Curated annotation (Swiss-Prot), chain B:
<dbReference type="GO" id="GO:0015935">
    <property type="term" value="C:small ribosomal subunit"/>
</dbReference>
<comment type="function">
    <text>Binds directly to 16S ribosomal RNA.</text>
</comment>
<dbReference type="GO" id="GO:0003735">
    <property type="term" value="F:structural constituent of ribosome"/>
</dbReference>
<dbReference type="GO" id="GO:0070181">
    <property type="term" value="F:small ribosomal subunit rRNA binding"/>
</dbReference>
<dbReference type="GO" id="GO:0005829">
    <property type="term" value="C:cytosol"/>
</dbReference>
<comment type="similarity">
    <text>Belongs to the bacterial ribosomal protein bS20 family.</text>
</comment>
<dbReference type="InterPro" id="IPR036510">
    <property type="entry name" value="Ribosomal_bS20_sf"/>
</dbReference>
From Swiss-Prot, chain C:
<comment type="function">
    <text>Binds to 23S rRNA. Forms part of two intersubunit bridges in the 70S ribosome.</text>
</comment>
<keyword id="KW-0694">RNA-binding</keyword>
<protein>
    <recommendedName>
        <fullName>Large ribosomal subunit protein uL14</fullName>
    </recommendedName>
</protein>
<dbReference type="InterPro" id="IPR036853">
    <property type="entry name" value="Ribosomal_uL14_sf"/>
</dbReference>
<dbReference type="InterPro" id="IPR005745">
    <property type="entry name" value="Ribosomal_uL14_bac-type"/>
</dbReference>
<comment type="similarity">
    <text>Belongs to the universal ribosomal protein uL14 family.</text>
</comment>
<dbReference type="GO" id="GO:0070180">
    <property type="term" value="F:large ribosomal subunit rRNA binding"/>
</dbReference>
From Swiss-Prot, chain D:
<keyword id="KW-0687">Ribonucleoprotein</keyword>
<protein>
    <recommendedName>
        <fullName>Small ribosomal subunit protein bS16</fullName>
    </recommendedName>
</protein>
<dbReference type="GO" id="GO:0003735">
    <property type="term" value="F:structural constituent of ribosome"/>
</dbReference>
<dbReference type="GO" id="GO:0005737">
    <property type="term" value="C:cytoplasm"/>
</dbReference>
<comment type="similarity">
    <text>Belongs to the bacterial ribosomal protein bS16 family.</text>
</comment>
<dbReference type="GO" id="GO:0006412">
    <property type="term" value="P:translation"/>
</dbReference>
<keyword id="KW-0689">Ribosomal protein</keyword>
Length: 95, 85, 122, 93
RNA sequence: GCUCGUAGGUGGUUUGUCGCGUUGUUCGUGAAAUCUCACGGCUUAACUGUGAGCGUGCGGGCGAUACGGGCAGACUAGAGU
RNA sequence: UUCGGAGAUACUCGAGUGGCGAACGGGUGAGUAACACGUGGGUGAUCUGCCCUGCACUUCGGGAUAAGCCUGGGAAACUGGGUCUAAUACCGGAUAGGACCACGGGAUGCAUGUCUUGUGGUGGAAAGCGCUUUAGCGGUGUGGGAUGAGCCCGCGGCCUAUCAGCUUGUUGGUGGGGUGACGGCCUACCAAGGCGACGACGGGUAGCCGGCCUGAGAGGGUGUCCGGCCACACUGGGACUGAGAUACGGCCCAGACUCCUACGGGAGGCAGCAGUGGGGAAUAUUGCACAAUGGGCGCAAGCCUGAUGCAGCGACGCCGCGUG
């Protein structure tokens, strides 16, 4: 007879997305963008630094992007079969 | 089968499937009827049948024949369907 | 009616799927094999790795024919295929089971095992 | 349901026991959510210990202990101090 | 056999910046059991329990920029005209 | 009261209806080179029965049916017909915000978006069962936890180029459908993209792991007891109920194998605990207890538990001790 009828939600910090940066190579597939990621990691036994790349897909709510386009991205819920990323901000446009 | 409970359990399963069948036949025929109403764009019978359609859909949700998430999915679906009629 | 140089499909599981009638046993110059007549045959093709190998001279009994056969009661029996089952010299099938319907004429020719394991006898 | 059950980790001739919180639909020697005590029934009185401040947390959130653990829970007194009984004090020796 | 050259690997001197590699610290995780240290008890042992390491790795924050890397430049010593 | 039957009223309770459980639990490693596994993250894109907590409600009714009884058919397996009866089984209602739509506020961002609200118009829930006279078990609508789970992703982890072109629902988008949920998961249309020499596609092999063996370490071999994860359950394909399904001892179908038939038809799945046969050089008792713990159910006592505790056999291995 005395309770608040709504126990408030326990304050939980918002889990953040993961952001990275890469170029673009291909653009003519209709609001989809392809960012070619980069990563360097210590070779497990010979101990060298190996340069390994990626080729991954990110969203464009507006289909404007040249070739190059150092841009940044963070994860999302899948919007296609192999869609996992979203473009966030475009910097140093394709020159 | 073998277990004394298993025969009884199947005897309940047939009851469940049949009484469920009545319900999903009802709601399928009714969503088809609503599509008949909306495609014609009468907007009078289409306006007044919602009082029956969401009524039986929520009846289905309460009795658990289907689940409330897809229930909401369908009701939003036809709500936005008439929202452009 | 089955005669020499007639191919019959095999209605058993010995491995042979088609045999070629060599002789119609049951007398000199006997021409046709009806339902329940015993045939010596050569296996013209068999399943790979099967028990009964291609080019094997075997004994078989005709169990279904596409030519209609009279029963004494004036009825007739007709199948869509000519089929025989490979048998041992004691009239028991070489295989372990019979596929497809079987003419009842094998009952009074003492192919009782074949009758027993046939899916259904007409 | 989340259970506070008595999980067996002993030898043939010694039944040492170690108390945690785990889901009911789980085997004994499985993954326990968190370890909160131990129980060795071989000494003269006993060997008993419960954390006594996560046990309150689990009992408050709804981790129901089993029938051998409920007795031990009255013994450590957490049951009485969780149910508001006048015997809130622990009574072990 | 020799050369050219693709990917790749690797790269002179110097300025400023980023801090990805690298590196420092903390937090979280790295289950339990296993292995190591110390005790305790099964007559000792094998075995067990408890406390401390291990869990080399990864994620977040706060530092650094010597070296490597990105960027914006500069030099002429390498290279070419 | 016959001397061996009646008397449900009556504790007690066979057969019967309903709920929960049966998805936990145990086994095997065939398949699988894969987000299957190890490690770390995202879910503003999600589900989660019974457990805990905060708040309102239990309000009117109806109609069937099992079981039972009388009977029919069939070899049985099983099944048809006719009366009759209930319930926390089923159906109809009234009110109820955590459905929806639209229009708005107020907070925060990481974009689709998130929460708290208001207005209006629509909507959906339940139940009773016992009492030595302060024995008690319930149910329903929801907010939040706890737990379990689902999905997605970075990194890591075999051989092989005497496998170089693979991909068409493939790559993306829109509108839909579908899902618990995002998603070509599916579909209509449109464009022609995606993966790959950092090894695509293919071939071979293989359950993976904490670990175990070895080694000074790095490495090499291996994945057996235990424990975690996955996959499977005679072979292959599919749905159902239910919160929850590779649904080992559930269902549907096809296939192979063994059995009964009165030949029309049916039943079975030890990689559960044993144990049998067969292969091998070779690995065991058709035992006891629910005493303990974990689990299932019931207000409870209590019943079930080949999980579990044990016990028997094999020097099979380690340790200890004797045969002075
Ligand atoms: Mg889209
Ligand atoms: Mg039952
Ligand atoms: Mg209909
Ligand atoms: Mg939808
Ligand atoms: Mg040169
Ligand atoms: Mg060169
Ligand atoms: Mg080059
Ligand atoms: Mg370079
Ligand atoms: Mg340099
Ligand atoms: Mg000692
Ligand atoms: Mg010691
Ligand atoms: Mg130890
Ligand atoms: Mg550890
Ligand atoms: Mg010069
Ligand atoms: Mg009874
Ligand atoms: Mg089962
Ligand atoms: Mg199971
Ligand atoms: Mg095996
Ligand atoms: Mg009645
Ligand atoms: Mg009602
Ligand atoms: Mg209403
Ligand atoms: Mg109940
Ligand atoms: Mg298409
Ligand atoms: Mg679409
Ligand atoms: Mg859609
Ligand atoms: Mg294999
Ligand atoms: Mg060495
Ligand atoms: Mg394993
Ligand atoms: Mg094994
Ligand atoms: Mg088998
Ligand atoms: Mg369901
Ligand atoms: Mg079975
Ligand atoms: Mg066994
Ligand atoms: Mg042998
Ligand atoms: Mg027990
Ligand atoms: Mg118990
Ligand atoms: Mg033993
Ligand atoms: Mg010994
Ligand atoms: Mg020996
Ligand atoms: Mg020794």
């Amino acid at each position: 007879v005395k309770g608040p009828k709504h126990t408030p939600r326990t304050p939980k910090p918002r889990g953040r997305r993961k952001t990275r940066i890469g170029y673009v190579v291909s653009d003519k597939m209709q609001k989809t963008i392809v960012v070619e990621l980069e990563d360097r990691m210590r070779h497990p036994l010979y101990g060298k630094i190996i340069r390994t790349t990626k080729k991954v897909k990110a969203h464009d709510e507006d289909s404007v992007a040249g070739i190059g386009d150092r841009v940044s991205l963070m994860e999302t819920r899948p919007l296609s079969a192999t869609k996992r990323w979203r473009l966030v901000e475009i910097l140093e446009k394709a020159k | 089968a073998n277990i004394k409970s298993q025969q009884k359990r199947n005897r309940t399963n047939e009851r469940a499937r049949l009484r469920n069948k009545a319900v999903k036949s009802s709601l399928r025929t009714a969503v088809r009827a609503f599509r008949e109403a909306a495609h014609a764009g009468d907007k009078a019978k289409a306006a007044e049948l919602l009082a029956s359609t969401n009524r039986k859909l929520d009846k289905a949700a309460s009795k658990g024949v289907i689940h409330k998430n897809q229930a909401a999915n369908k009701k939003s679906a036809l709500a936005q369907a008439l929202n452009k009629l | 009616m089955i005669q020499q140089e007639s191919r019959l499909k095999v209605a058993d599981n010995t491995g042979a799927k088609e045999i070629l009638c060599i002789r119609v046993l049951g007398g000199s110059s006997r021409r046709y094999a009806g339902i329940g007549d015993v045939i010596v045959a050569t296996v013209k093709d068999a399943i790979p790795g099967g028990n009964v190998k291609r080019g094997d001279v075997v004994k078989a009994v005709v169990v279904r024919t596409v030519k209609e056969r009279r029963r004494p009661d004036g009825s007739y029996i007709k199948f869509d295929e000519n089929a025989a089952v490979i048998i041992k010299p004691d009239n028991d099938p070489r295989g372990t089971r019979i596929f497809g319907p079987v003419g009842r004429e094998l009952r009074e020719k003492r192919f009782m095992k074949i009758i027993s394991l046939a899916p259904e006898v007409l | 349901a989340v259970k506070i059950k008595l999980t067996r980790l002993g030898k043939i001739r010694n039944p040492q026991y170690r108390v945690a919180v785990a889901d009911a639909r789980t085997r004994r020697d499985g993954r326990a959510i968190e370890v909160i005590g131990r129980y060795h029934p071989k000494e003269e009185p006993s060997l008993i210990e419960i954390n006594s401040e996560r046990a309150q947390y689990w009992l408050s959130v709804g981790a129901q202990p089993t029938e051998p653990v409920l007795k031990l829970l009255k013994i450590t007194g957490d049951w009485q101090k969780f149910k508001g009984l006048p015997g809130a004090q622990g009574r072990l020796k």
